[PDB]
């Protein structure tokens, strides 16, 4: 509940703490269906402007239907679309759409079991068939084309509008749209759907508190236009874990403070990103895009996560812990750079580059020395390095500065490796061992030279 | 004005010149506010189609307000918001919304000073509160509930349309929407905002000349919805530097001309991208996405730029100058490839691949030899390498071809490094010296075979 950032100068890395994350571990497919009308022939003769507008709207509807049929011809349109594709093929089988229609005739929501053996909730968001057949079809059939009420046209447009907006978003995306817009599924409809989902109370509460992340993680797959039914699968996320202890790790380059150019060796911890607890193991998220962050809850997605044993956490507080092998990168470029964490900023200055930290009212207040150093988030509102300007966030929480001797010091630059994208403490240790083995082999060579 | 694209065959690199620059170094946050109406109860008892449409529009408005409240629950939703969310929490403090509401009562635009010590300009784009309370609220209050005419419904739809699209963009983007659409801020209102922004008149002129780049660089953060106010911070860019001399650098692989496979060593300068002059130092932009290019003015953004000493410019005309140590890449793959510069194209052919330059009417006119060669943009219109095809842009300007001996010739393939992501001439020469020291040590060993 309280974020306690901890900066370790030993690696000069900032590990946040006290996050209540909620991993996404499943999907739930809802067959959202719209009842279309199979109207193709116009018979009444009317030159009125209102009748022309109605016919134009019907032409737009027919073109939308044809575009959806083309999208179906594009269908089937990992773990992201499968169950959407699986329901797409199931609805193609004879009788499945008829069973959906029969079940949803009585109510706008139902639970339907299909031939595949899976039961899914079906939601009738829009009933265009009823409106078309009951209101404008009688006028279109009679030769008079008797429309004395303009509002119906507008009403029709409104009733048609969503469908067009459904088709357009489909047409540009070829039947796979994400995030789910408010046209695929309204927020009220989505919230009403979360209650009918077969989940715990905790999951309903979690996905009702943060509904926007549900849309950001959702999907909408074109499935089938057939038998006066337009069915698309809305693939909502499923959070198996809730309020698990999650923490972020920000890493900044640590290079030697040597003034002479060339002797700069930079060691950056590569396990940068998010970590969460799940089933006794740590789910690691390297990409920062997958883990959305609300005020205190780190919503994530195990679609690309990596499972890890628990002792990886022991690598955060102990670099040389025998339990886990931390991952580091050895480079030579010592370009000054800063990273804005949740409760401050890490700033690495090398060479002749200047770094300043300034407050809004007090102006420039701090000048940074060589190396990587961390500044808190209260009383320091901006940090300028060279010519670039990173704003320090104003998030409220405890921050701890830990005095740590830089780990780059104990590694000799001459034998230190270069441009190693991903390594490990034992991996760099054995690289150093092999380099020193070459060194002592050369020592043996000169020893033989001296003795002979 | 005169773009003097100079190609150097030494490293076969094309440097453009004569480019004016407008660097982005600041932000200006304007609190764009919409006056909502807190209506929750409907007293109408009419079943007319117009009344049904009015109720539907009001329900859409209420759902938009609820969605904006959920987005507020997502707020605060790295200076692109660090300055933007700082105004959100200020507006959360008691009385800070009320002062804006009172100050903007008289005029649709006013500078308001907040409790943070920073005064910002507030702009009332849409007064929905007045329209709701003065036109449809009296209709709702009366028991008759008779809409005066359908044009009132259409006007209500048109006024509410901007708010509905604002809510849609906010919901799909979770509040932070970029580029700023024409619903966030109309172009006329954006121009007025630029006029009332306190800046150099040069900045006002430059922004008025290129509003599209302003939109592409802009932001719109949802701050607050409270007290019949919907405030979002539109933070426009702020160009502290104007008409600074900028220049691009395009680099193409330079590999050995030997036909035998495996002997091709490829050198490609990694400092490619844009450079600009700023306060006596060069702002380098590693990637070309940040620096949008107009006819002659290359609008940029220092949020990702790197400061560099001035003498880096002397690196472009002299890669071996002791003033600056340029950046290169030493790879082995000699795949034929072309890069289309502003006034021609660089084409690198190796192995058995064929490269042709062709004109629209004259057809194929030139066949390329081994190495990297540059072709101008007048008299040649297309370049085909292997099976792939690129153009040459028809931009008008002087292009100078410079005869330069290939720098790859001076580097011996046996000791040349491989797959180096980002090297430097000092780095390459020092590792070459290390390899030569290794071969000298092996010579010492073979001599120690004798000598005794």
């Amino acid at each position: 509940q309280n974020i306690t950032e901890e900066f370790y100068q030993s690696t000069c890395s900032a590990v946040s703490k006290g996050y209540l994350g909620a991993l996404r571990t499943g999907w739930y497919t809802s067959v959202i269906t719209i009842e279309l009308s199979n109207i193709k022939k116009n018979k009444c003769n009317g030159t009125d402007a209102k009748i022309k507008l109605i016919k134009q709207e019907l032409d737009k509807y027919k073109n939308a239907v044809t575009d959806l049929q083309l999208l179906m011809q594009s269908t089937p349109a990992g773990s992201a679309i499968c169950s959407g594709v699986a329901v797409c093929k199931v609805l193609h089988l004879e009788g499945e759409v008829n069973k959906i229609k029969s079940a949803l005739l009585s109510t706008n929501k139902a639970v339907v079991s299909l031939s595949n053996g899976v039961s899914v909730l079906t939601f009738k968001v829009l009933d265009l068939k009823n409106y078309i057949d009951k209101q404008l079809l009688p006028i279109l059939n009679k030769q008079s084309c008797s429309i004395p009420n303009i509002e119906t046209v507008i009403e029709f447009q409104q009733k048609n509008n969503r469908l067009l907006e459904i088709t357009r978003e489909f047409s540009v995306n070829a039947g796979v749209t994400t995030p789910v817009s408010t046209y695929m599924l309204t927020n009220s409809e989505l919230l009403s759907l979360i209650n009918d989902m077969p989940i715990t109370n905790d999951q309903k509460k979690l996905m009702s508190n943060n509904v926007q992340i549900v849309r950001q993680q959702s999907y909408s797959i074109m499935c089938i236009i057939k038998e006066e039914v337009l069915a698309y699968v809305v693939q909502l996320p499923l959070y198996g874990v809730i309020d698990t202890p999650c923490w972020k790790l920000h890493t900044s380059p640590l290079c030697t403070t040597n003034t002479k150019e060339g002797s700069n060796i930079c060691l950056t911890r590569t396990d940068r990103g998010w970590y969460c607890d799940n089933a006794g193991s740590v789910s690691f998220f390297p990409q920062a895009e997958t883990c959305k962050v609300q005020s205190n809850r780190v919503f994530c997605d195990t679609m690309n996560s990596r499972t890890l044993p628990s002792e990886v956490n022991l690598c955060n507080v102990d670099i040389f812990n025998p339990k886990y092998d931390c991952k580091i990168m050895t480079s030579k470029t010592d370009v000054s750079s800063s990273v804005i964490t949740s409760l401050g900023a890490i700033v690495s200055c090398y060479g002749k580059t200047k770094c300043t930290a300034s407050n809004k009212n007090r102006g420039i207040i701090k000048t940074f020395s060589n190396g990587c150093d961390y500044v808190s988030n209260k009383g320091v509102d901006t940090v300028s390095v060279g010519n670039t300007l990173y704003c320090v966030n104003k998030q409220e929480g405890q921050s701890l500065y830990v005095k740590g001797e830089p780990i780059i010091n104990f590694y000799d630059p001459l034998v230190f490796p270069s441009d190693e994208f991903d390594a490990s403490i034992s991996q760099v240790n054995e690289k150093i061992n092999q380099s020193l083995a070459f060194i002592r082999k050369s020592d043996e060579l000169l020893s033989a030279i001296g003795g002979y | 004005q005169n773009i003097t694209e100079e190609f150097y065959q030494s490293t076969c690199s094309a440097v453009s010149k004569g480019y004016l620059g407008a660097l982005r170094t600041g932000w200006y946050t304007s609190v764009i506010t919409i006056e909502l109406s807190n209506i929750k109860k409907n007293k109408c008892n009419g079943t007319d189609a117009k009344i049904k449409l009015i109720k539907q529009e009001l329900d859409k408005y209420k759902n938009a307000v609820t969605d904006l409240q959920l987005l507020m629950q997502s707020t605060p939703a790295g200076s692109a918001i660090c300055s933007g969310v700082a105004v959100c929490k200020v507006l959360h403090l008691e009385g800070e919304v009320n002062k804006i509401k009172s100050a903007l009562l008289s005029t649709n635009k006013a500078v308001v000073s907040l409790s943070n010590g920073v005064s910002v300009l507030t702009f009332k784009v849409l007064d929905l509160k007045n329209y709701i309370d003065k036109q449809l609220l009296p209709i709702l209050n009366k028991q008759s509930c008779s809409i005066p005419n359908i044009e009132t419904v259409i006007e209500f739809q048109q006024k509410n349309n901007r708010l509905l699209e604002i809510t849609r963009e906010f919901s799909v983007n979770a509040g932070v929407t970029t580029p700023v659409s024409t619903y966030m801020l109309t172009n006329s209102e954006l121009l007025s905002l630029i006029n009332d922004m306190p800046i150099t008149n040069d900045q006002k002129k430059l922004m008025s000349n290129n509003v599209q780049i302003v939109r592409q660089q802009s932001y719109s953060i949802m701050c607050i919805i409270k007290e019949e106010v919907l405030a979002y911070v539109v933070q426009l860019p702020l160009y502290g530097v104007i008409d600074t001399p900028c220049w691009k650098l395009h680099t193409s692989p330079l590999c050995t001309t030997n036909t035998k496979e495996g002997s091709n060593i490829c050198l490609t300068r990694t400092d490619r991208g844009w450079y600009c002059d700023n306060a006596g130092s060069v702002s380098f932009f590693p990637q070309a996405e940040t620096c949008k290019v107009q006819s002659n003015r290359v609008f940029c953004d220092t949020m990702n730029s790197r400061t560099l000493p001035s003498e880096v410019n002397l690196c472009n005309v002299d890669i071996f100058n002791p003033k600056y140590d340029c950046k290169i890449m030493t790879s082995k793959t000699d795949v034929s490839s072309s890069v289309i510069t502003s006034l021609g194209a660089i084409v690198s052919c190796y192995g058995k691949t064929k490269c042709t330059a062709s004109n629209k009417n004259r057809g194929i006119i030139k066949t390329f030899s081994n190495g990297c060669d540059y072709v101008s943009n007048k008299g040649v219109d297309t370049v085909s390498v292997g099976n792939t095809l690129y153009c040459v842009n028809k931009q008008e300007g002087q292009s100078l071809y410079v005869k330069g001996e290939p720098i790859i010739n001076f580097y011996d393939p046996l000791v040349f490094p491989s797959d180096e992501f980002d090297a430097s001439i000092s780095q390459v020469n020092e590792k070459i010296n290390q390899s030569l020291a290794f071969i000298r040590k092996s010579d010492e060993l073979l001599s120690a075979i004798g000598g005794y």
Partner: nanobody, 121 residues
Framework: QVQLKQSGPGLVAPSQSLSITCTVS????????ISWIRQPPGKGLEWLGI???????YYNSAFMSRLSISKDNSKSQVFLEMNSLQTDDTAIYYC???????????????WGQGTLVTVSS
């Protein structure tokens, strides 16, 4: 300490709308869920929906068509309303609390003083 005060009439004619308000004190509504349990005379307790911290609600499937729970954070108040109340719905209503997204929440710890509701004309 924490406390919940319940206001609103209990007796209501059949097939009418019954309203009630639970005003909380000692904690923030923006952190505590607030359920609504019902105890018929001489019978056990039954659940009548809930409204979460974010304002969303999860009604009971039986009363989903009539039950209505709302919340206002600023006044720290919760509102319950039922429609089409019939003779069977005479009971005692408790505006019980909840916790967080965890077991260790003291599920239903601090209950209201309880408001009797006798549905009759």
């Amino acid at each position: 300490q924490v406390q919940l005060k319940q206001s609103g009439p209990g007796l209501v004619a059949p097939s009418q709308s019954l309203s009630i308000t639970c005003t909380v004190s000692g904690f923030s509504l923006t952190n505590y869920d607030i359920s609504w349990i019902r105890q018929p005379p001489g019978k056990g307790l039954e659940w009548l929906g809930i409204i979460w911290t974010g304002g969303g609600t999860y009604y009971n499937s039986a009363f989903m068509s009539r039950l209505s729970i709302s919340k206002d954070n600023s006044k720290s108040q919760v509102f319950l309303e039922m429609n089409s109340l019939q003779t069977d719905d005479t009971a005692i209503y408790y505006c019980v609390r909840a916790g967080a997204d965890y077991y260790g929440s003291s599920p239903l710890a601090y209950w209201g003083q309880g408001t009797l509701v006798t549905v009759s004309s």
